[model samples]
Target: ACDYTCGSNCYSSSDVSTAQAAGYKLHEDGETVGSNSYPHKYNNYEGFDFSVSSPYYEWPILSSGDVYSGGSPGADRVVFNENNQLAGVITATGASGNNFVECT
Candidate 1:
């Protein structure tokens, strides 16, 4: 369930409303419509994580709702629940801040 936020329009991959806004049309396959008539790249990037603003913190897609956010000083860590929802957020170095455990 990847919802692409294109400008002010957010729609399902099958929806062409956002595509049309980008001067493109939805192909009959209901996947892609652009210069090369490419299809949706959902399957190509299923387990990939991405960030909207900075790469220091990325929201990865997971069924278990596990999130990973780590960086240098003055960073943040965002926590998510088992239902893939935001649970809480904390800074890296602050009043209630600490170091992150090494990934095994």
Candidate 2:
């Protein structure tokens, strides 16, 4: 059930949902965690075809099956909006520094 493959990382649909839920919950409560302050605004510098609303937020979605709390954010991320709607999955796997590419 490999719904997504970000570089060497593999994620299932369930994994994305779980990760999104956690991140959205924190967003709803107006909170953040980790060294980089996750669940923060994603400016959509890549300009992918999200076809969704703006003011997107990015949260870490680990391939290790554990929720993100701190430390390295890995490469993968779940991009969601203010309505908790998933815009897409993106990763920094094969991109330049801090830049991201969509997960196919």
Candidate 3:
């Protein structure tokens, strides 16, 4: 029933949209919300094939129905580009260290 699954956590399209919307807004404003400084540039260190261009950012997508504003980013993330396109859904789950793997 979930649109995306990050490890054991499940998420829907709305969840991804909510998180992406908030994050991309800040990105367009060229500002960050708070402490954690998320929605930051996500360097393609993992070499994931994102059809979108660079200037990508990663934003927190919470499974608990909460919007992220610089708190702990948890595991699930909504990756988007400068064009506000959904690059992909990635997670720290099943990945070692702070790296990410594509969410199934």
Residue 90 accuracy (lDDT) in model 1: 28
Question: Residue 15 in model 1: shift from native, Å?
Answer: 23
Clashing pairs in 1: none
Question: Candidates' lDDT values, in order?
Answer: 0.27, 0.90, 0.88
**Overall local distance difference test of candidate 3:** 0.88
Name the runs in model 1 displaced over 4 angstroms: 1-74, 96-104
Best by lDDT: 2
lDDT of 1 at 80: 33
Per residue, candidate 1 scores C-alpha lDDT tens digits across 78-98 of 323223233223223223233
TM-score of each: 0.23, 0.94, 0.92
> Against the correct fold, how does model 3 do in TM-score?
0.92
Cα RMSD (Å) per model? 16.2, 1.0, 1.2
Query: Candidate 1: how large is its RMSD?
Result: 16.2
Return the clash pairs for model 3, or none: none
